Amino acid sequence: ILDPSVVGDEHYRVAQEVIRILQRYKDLQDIIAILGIDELSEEDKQLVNRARRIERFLSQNMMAAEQFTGQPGSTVPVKETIEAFDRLCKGDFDHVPEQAFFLIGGLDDLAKKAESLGAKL
Amino acid sequence: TEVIKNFKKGFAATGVVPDEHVEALDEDKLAKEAVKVKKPAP
Amino acid sequence: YTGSAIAQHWMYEGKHVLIIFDDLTKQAEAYRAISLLLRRPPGREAYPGD
Amino acid sequence: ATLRELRGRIRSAGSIKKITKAQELIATSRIARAQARLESARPYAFEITRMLTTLAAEAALDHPLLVERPEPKRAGVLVVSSDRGLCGAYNANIFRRSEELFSLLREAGKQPVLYVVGRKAQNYYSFRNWNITESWMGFSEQPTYENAAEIASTLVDAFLLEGVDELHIVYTEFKSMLSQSAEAHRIAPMVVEYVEEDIGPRTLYSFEPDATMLFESLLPRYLTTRVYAALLESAASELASRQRAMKSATDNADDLIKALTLMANRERQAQITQEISEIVGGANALA
């Protein structure tokens, strides 16, 4: 059902953008493994930073994981998720550290953790 | 060919420095090149 | 299995038992030996299906 | 199938590892040479500084390069980076330092004008739609005094004038062979720093034709000497960064070789086992 006629045009567009960014990151993983990130293009560096932040934002604190960490779970509506990952792919959070995307819920959790890490959005 | 040529003139293709949100450098980290003059004159 | 039986006898009496299986890889190798000597068809890494 | 691909990837990683180890040793040699050049250029800088200080102690300190113009509107930033790219975070640290400097300038109402030295800075700023006034490439490996003279002359002529009110420079200070720090210096206008008295029965100097003419013909030479020292230090720092980057790169290539060899041997065993399974399955099917 990941289909423009089922989930909507914007849902599909954002999902395809996330997938394209992560696929280019996986394509670059060879050079990134040997030489690091500083040899890439400027556009490739931008995209790899976006991809690290995206692959960290897809993480989440689950309700069933409170037994392992003690941190309660999160529920993110699909519209907030679409809006968030749209802003991620567009490039709004390239300044926030790679953490503060790690095991959170929506954008409010992102802002709170980012300001706990000394950043603003 | 001519239809393409007369179409390309009216086509509206969709082609500024970003913010980078980098904090300001500490005014005392910026080193100052000084002439170290030996006459005390406040 | 001998160790596990000796331990379960105590477990079912209300005791607390700890059992260490020094190597389960070597038990798997012995069982694979037995299974290949019985001409049973092997699977991944020539290990039995079970 | 993937046995061929795994052996090919092992060969590729071996080639990369050989090249990176060669580059690391070459960078060691070249930074020895660069440190030599820097240390031998030091004495002229020391003595021109001494001559300038003993000229300024008895002159008129109203040279254009010494007064802070009221209401500065623009600042000139010279960003010294590299041409070859196998360095580590060298250009990265340079650019983050220059971005901190740009935000410092904009928090005081000065729109920065940008001059760069190297190819990596031009990539970094042409990607971000910046307007670089003048560029300089091809001499970040072995900078000479004529390049420093050209750079400093264009800088002071844009300062004395489309015209800027102060000159900054962002380069990598070299120290310790393990310290490479991107620093932002303010080369113009100079602050004046009354040091000491150090003048008792000491004999006064004699100037020909006078004090201020010598001072005003010696100041641009001082700024050029400072730019030359900056270029030399940034070259030595780039070579240190390249040596470390190539060491880590050859270590990563070694670990990739190890992992690929492990997976290739795993597959090799798996292929032999599966082939034996097929052969014996057919042989049993026939019996």
UniProtKB/Swiss-Prot annotation, chain A:
Compartment(s): Cell membrane
Domain of life: Bacteria
Function: Produces ATP from ADP in the presence of a proton gradient across the membrane. The catalytic sites are hosted primarily by the beta subunits.
Family: Belongs to the ATPase alpha/beta chains family.
Self-association state and partner proteins as the record states: F-type ATPases have 2 components, CF(1) - the catalytic core - and CF(0) - the membrane proton channel. CF(1) has five subunits: alpha(3), beta(3), gamma(1), delta(1), epsilon(1). CF(0) has three main subunits: a(1), b(2) and c(9-12). The alpha and beta chains form an alternating ring which encloses part of the gamma chain. CF(1) is attached to CF(0) by a central stalk formed by the gamma and epsilon chains, while a peripheral stalk is formed by the delta and b chains.
The protein's name in its UniProt record: ATP synthase subunit beta
Highest classification ranks of the organism: Bacteria, Bacillati, Actinomycetota, Actinomycetes, Mycobacteriales
Boundaries of the shown chain within the full protein: 366 to 486 of 486
Swiss-Prot record, chain B:
Domain of life: Bacteria
Location of this chain's protein in the cell: Cell membrane
The protein's role, per its UniProt record: Produces ATP from ADP in the presence of a proton gradient across the membrane. The alpha chain is a regulatory subunit.
Family membership noted in the UniProt record: Belongs to the ATPase alpha/beta chains family.
Subunit structure: F-type ATPases have 2 components, CF(1) - the catalytic core - and CF(0) - the membrane proton channel. CF(1) has five subunits: alpha(3), beta(3), gamma(1), delta(1), epsilon(1). CF(0) has three main subunits: a(1), b(2) and c(9-12). The alpha and beta chains form an alternating ring which encloses part of the gamma chain. CF(1) is attached to CF(0) by a central stalk formed by the gamma and epsilon chains, while a peripheral stalk is formed by the delta and b chains.
Name of the protein described by the UniProt record: ATP synthase subunit alpha
Source organism (scientific name): Mycobacterium tuberculosis (strain ATCC 25618 / H37Rv)
Residues of the full protein shown: 501 to 545 of 549
Swiss-Prot record, chain C:
Cellular location(s): Cell membrane
Domain of life per record: Bacteria
Primary role: Produces ATP from ADP in the presence of a proton gradient across the membrane. The alpha chain is a regulatory subunit.
Family, as annotated: Belongs to the ATPase alpha/beta chains family.
Record note on quaternary structure: F-type ATPases have 2 components, CF(1) - the catalytic core - and CF(0) - the membrane proton channel. CF(1) has five subunits: alpha(3), beta(3), gamma(1), delta(1), epsilon(1). CF(0) has three main subunits: a(1), b(2) and c(9-12). The alpha and beta chains form an alternating ring which encloses part of the gamma chain. CF(1) is attached to CF(0) by a central stalk formed by the gamma and epsilon chains, while a peripheral stalk is formed by the delta and b chains.
Protein's recorded name: ATP synthase subunit alpha
Protein source organism: Mycobacterium tuberculosis (strain ATCC 25618 / H37Rv)
Gene that encodes it: atpA
From Swiss-Prot, chain D:
Superkingdom, taxonomy of origin: Bacteria
Pfam families documented for this protein: ATP-synt
Any single Gene Ontology cellular-component annotation: peptidoglycan-based cell wall
Keyword Ribonucleoprotein set for record: no
Molecular functions (GO terms): ATP binding; proton-transporting ATP synthase activity, rotational mechanism
Cell compartment(s), UniProt: Cell membrane
GO BP term, example: proton motive force-driven plasma membrane ATP synthesis
Keywords annotated in UniProt: ATP synthesis, Cell membrane, CF(1), Hydrogen ion transport, Ion transport, Membrane, Transport
Role of this protein: Produces ATP from ADP in the presence of a proton gradient across the membrane. The gamma chain is believed to be important in regulating ATPase activity and the flow of protons through the CF(0) complex.
Quaternary organization: F-type ATPases have 2 components, CF(1) - the catalytic core - and CF(0) - the membrane proton channel. CF(1) has five subunits: alpha(3), beta(3), gamma(1), delta(1), epsilon(1). CF(0) has three main subunits: a, b and c.
The protein's name in its UniProt record: ATP synthase gamma chain
Organism of provenance: Mycobacterium tuberculosis (strain ATCC 25618 / H37Rv)
